[PDB]
């Protein structure tokens, strides 16, 4: 097959990211896997004249170790190729479907040759314990999993594979993102699962051996309590929370309510609700129930996700592009392992973003950098990796998105 | 010899051409020394003489070897190196003795003339051209180019290492039972064969190496145990750091104290309990290395305690892959933590130290957690797995912290061990307002140009008060106003602030701070029976917030 010429974005050089230390069991699983891939010609050992590197990890799906390459830098540095030059259009109808199934089709890439001149940029290293030896160095000979270039290049072949099935089912939406296919229909869950089975058979002829419910997706509205008697402290928390909301939702009003907070009162004192405060309150509940008037997705802009730890295995999140301009808010709940729970929430929030916008967010994670770096791999199950940074949650924000 | 191994293809940086620097004219004795050196290298094939067209050039020099009458050829590859491609890193991390398995028998081999025993990419040799100038530079010089890896060229260490690795590979496949560590131009080789069948396997290895152009010391010339390697002393069943001598001096300079701290830091790998806080404190400030620093009393106490620890020699043991690793941590005092890692109590594989602060304000629970994370990482590096921890903190204390703190946090399998001082939380804030506890509405404000400040409070019992602060930031006054309310209130108090800043700091339950204020607030929060902290939006006309906002201005 004829390779597609690939080019880095102008000026900038390839990835030079350091390999993270790996446990012995993961190093062994990677050696096994790469020894096998090498025999099959998918990768080749390289010399020191290749200065690039990207990190690799082992994840365990199933009781089978799998290789995960962290192509975040390469993807960032080749962004002209997979986004503007080629690039898969994202369907707005996908998020509308009653059911969306995610199928892994990463195996497909291993049969397409990679541009000879681009191969050096896919260099990665298997480390050794206590630096007994130099790492084992490899680069790719075929479209690698995890590179955003791979689906971009395999795009026109995927279209042929899917054409009979699309023609036969015009009301099914199929979208490719990185290594996965997203398949949405409005069918009853039995006919839906049957169609996925059929799709698998189509894929199976070309060497490609869970269910979302986007309808069930709705805002996690900032909730104002319904209370029996209100204390000064309670009214204060209310104003605080509505004060925050008014940064986001037009039409939020606070006047009638904090009229109640007059003079210097003991925090536990009971204060009766004004006919007006109660209307204002209710009128605010109306507004919080709905989407944010004035906020729209700008496809030229990165997505950001903030996560808050709420205790009792509950986590709240917001997605926006400019701060406080929420495109979406939600929650994930239910381990007494914080890192494990955070990992799950990140993957779930990422998955939603792909379906909604065909883009992955950069996460602001409420956790020590080193803690996350050591541990996230133990639980990660996806075949992509979002960008993340590490942040200390403002104690206020956590409170205002409480449930 | 020059290895018959295939060459590594090498190129210059994408926009660049090879060097073309001008040979300085040299004295006659230097010209003579170079001719003699180059002729001998030419005979072994290390270099080949050339004439133009080759346009490239790198300057050569000759230096007199020590007091001796031997000459050495120095090549200044500064330019060629700027113009040479980047290579992947040679070897990122060096072996730690604590991570070695025990070996019945071991041999140390160093490759002779390592670089000169490995061939240079044929296409690249021309860029290494240099010129021995003629006497006073009158006639055309004698021009050579390298056929082997030049000393001081950018690519040599990486290409050598990869050549040794390609060469060693076949011997590794056929000999899994045998260990070979590569470090620079050394090999360290070990088995659990008795001396006989080992000396024999070594010879196979030397011979394999010779087939490939690499010469090594014979039995007679191989170093003997113990090995002094990289600051360490390696023996058949223990290791330690090389002997450490702490100088006695009447007066210490900046440079003496830096060197002392370096030695102590090196010693802390295996000597438990070394401390350097009070010695590093001295290093604070701006001074010349020559300047004498009077030892504070605490520094002097610390040097003595260190002195006693070093008095008797200590050693570590090697790693047994079939046993778990246990890690123990102890609080040593003000921000200082020490740890030991053993598999059999209490024969340490190694020890270590942790001090770093993470911010201006922390508590002991956070710090302990950071030390656990740091030890976990080092343990994965050295042994390829995480240790089981024994921590001086009650399970209940840790779970009370984990549940209520806003950051995700987590430590692997651990157990409590009663080794005081134990780590605890020294106060907890109320989760609800306190009935019958006076409510203080506090505020602070500073004028941006003046730096004048007013901190105050109004209470629901009609108390009021404001003090004036000089040269204070708008956020220092917010802390003052809270301190003020703490020191005028009862054992139970509700405090209402509009400072997210102040709230953030207090809500994290600090037990130590770089701030005097925060440290005074803390000693107050400990005294109390109950404290509840609420936050309100500033300037919304809320409650008593307006009243105290008005008094400060
Ligand atoms: C990094 C380095 C550097 C140098 C050097 N120079 C020597 C060694 C070793 O010998 C060594 C090795 C080698 C094979 C990597 C090992 O696997 N395990 C081990 O315990 N040792 C120490 C030792 C063992 C022994 N029986 N007698 C001694 F005296 C020392 C290691
Ligand atoms: Cl769902």
UniProtKB/Swiss-Prot annotation, chain B:
Task: Give the result of residue 188 to L, as annotated.
Answer: Confers resistance to efavirenz
Q: What is the effect of changing residue 44 to A?
A: Confers resistance to lamivudine
The record lists the effect of residue 75 to M as: Confers resistance to stavudine and zalcitabine
Tell me where it resides: Virion
Q: What is the effect of changing residue 74 to V?
A: Confers resistance to abacavir, didanosine, HBY 097 and zalcitabine
Query: Quick one: effect of changing residue 283 to I?
Result: Confers resistance to delavirdine, efavirenz and nevirapine
**Outcome of substituting residue 70 to E:** Confers resistance to adefovir and lamivudine
Q: What is the effect of changing residue 101 to P?
A: Confers resistance to TMC125
Instruction: Kindly list the residue ranges recorded as spanning the membrane.
Output: none
Q: What is the effect of changing residue 219 to Q?
A: Confers resistance to zidovudine
Q: Where is this site: Essential for RT p66/p51 heterodimerization?
A: 401, 414
Q: What is the effect of changing residue 119 to S?
A: Confers resistance to lodenosine
Upon changing residue 151 to M, the result is: Confers multi-NRTI resistance
Reverse transcriptase domain ranges (all copies): 44-234
Cite the effect that the entry attributes to residue 208 to Y: Confers resistance to lamivudine, pyrophosphate analog PFA and zidovudine
Result, substituting residue 234 to A: Complete loss of RT dimerization
* Effect annotated for changing residue 219 to E: Confers resistance to zidovudine
What result follows from mutating residue 190 to Q? Confers resistance to efavirenz, HBY 097 and nevirapine
Q: What is the effect of changing residue 181 to C?
A: Confers multi-NNRTI resistance
| Outcome recorded upon mutating residue 135 to L | Confers resistance to delavirdine, efavirenz and nevirapine
Q: Where is the RNase H type-1 domain?
A: 434-553
Q: What is the effect of changing residue 219 to R?
A: Confers resistance to lamivudine, stavudine, zalcicabine and zidovudine
Q: What is the effect of changing residue 54 to D?
A: Confers resistance to stavudine
The extra comment attached to this record reads: Error-prone enzyme that lacks a proof-reading function. High mutations rate is a direct consequence of this characteristic. RT also displays frequent template switching leading to high recombination rate. Recombination mostly occurs between homologous regions of the two copackaged RNA genomes. If these two RNA molecules derive from different viral strains, reverse transcription will give rise to highly recombinated proviral DNAs.
Subunit info?
Answer: Heterodimer of p66 RT and p51 RT (RT p66/p51). Heterodimerization of RT is essential for DNA polymerase activity. The overall folding of the subdomains is similar in p66 RT and p51 RT but the spatial arrangements of the subdomains are dramatically different.
| Protein name stated in the entry | Reverse transcriptase/ribonuclease H
Which organism encodes this protein?
A: Human immunodeficiency virus type 1 group M subtype B (isolate HXB2)
Full-protein residues shown:
588 to 1140 of 1435
């Amino acid at each position: 097959i004829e390779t597609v010429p690939v080019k880095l974005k102008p000026g900038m050089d390839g990835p030079k990211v350091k390999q993270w230390p790996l446990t012995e069991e993961k190093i062994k699983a990677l050696v096994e896997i790469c020894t096998e891939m090498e025999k099959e010609g998918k990768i080749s050992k390289i010399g020191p004249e290749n200065p690039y590197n990207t990190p690799v990890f082992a994840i365990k799906k199933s009781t089978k170790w799998r290789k995960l390459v962290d192509f975040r830098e390469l993807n960032k540095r080749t962004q002209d190729f997979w986004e503007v030059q080629l690039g898969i259009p994202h369907p707005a109808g996908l998020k509308k479907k009653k059911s969306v199934t995610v199928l892994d089709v990463g195996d497909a890439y291993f049969s397409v040759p990679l541009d000879e001149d681009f191969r050096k940029y896919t260099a990665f290293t298997i480390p050794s314990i206590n630096n007994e030896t130099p790492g084992i160095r490899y680069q790719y000979n075929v479209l690698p999993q995890g590179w955003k270039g791979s689906p971009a290049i395999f795009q026109s072949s995927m279209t042929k594979i899917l054409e009979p099935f699309r023609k036969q089912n015009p009301d099914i939406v199929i979208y490719q993102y990185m290594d996965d296919l997203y398949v949405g229909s409005d069918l009853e869950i039995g006919q839906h699962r049957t169609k996925i089975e059929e799709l698998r058979q189509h894929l199976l002829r070309w060497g490609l051996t869970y269910e979302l419910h986007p309808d069930k997706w709705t805002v996690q509205p900032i909730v104002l309590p319904e209370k029996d008697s209100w204390t000064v402290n309670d009214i204060q928390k209310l104003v605080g929370k509505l004060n925050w909301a008014s940064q986001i939702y037009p039409g939020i009003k606070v006047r009638q309510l904090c009229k109640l907070l007059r003079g210097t009162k003991a925090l536990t004192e009971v204060i009766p609700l004004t006919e007006e405060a109660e209307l204002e309150l209710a009128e605010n509940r109306e507004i919080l129930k709905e989407p944010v008037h004035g906020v729209y997705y700008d496809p030229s802009k990165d997505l950001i996700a903030e996560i808050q730890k709420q205790g009792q295995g509950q986590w709240t999140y917001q997605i926006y592009q400019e701060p406080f301009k929420n495109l979406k808010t939600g929650k994930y709940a239910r381990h007494t392992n914080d890192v494990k729970q955070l990992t799950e929430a990140v993957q779930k929030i990422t998955t939603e973003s792909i379906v909604i916008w065909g883009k992955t967010p950069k996460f602001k994670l409420p956790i020590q950098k080193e803690t996350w770096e050591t541990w996230w791999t133990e639980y990660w199950q996806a075949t992509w990796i979002p960008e993340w940074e590490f942040v200390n949650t403002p104690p206020l924000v956590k409170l205002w998105y409480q449930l």
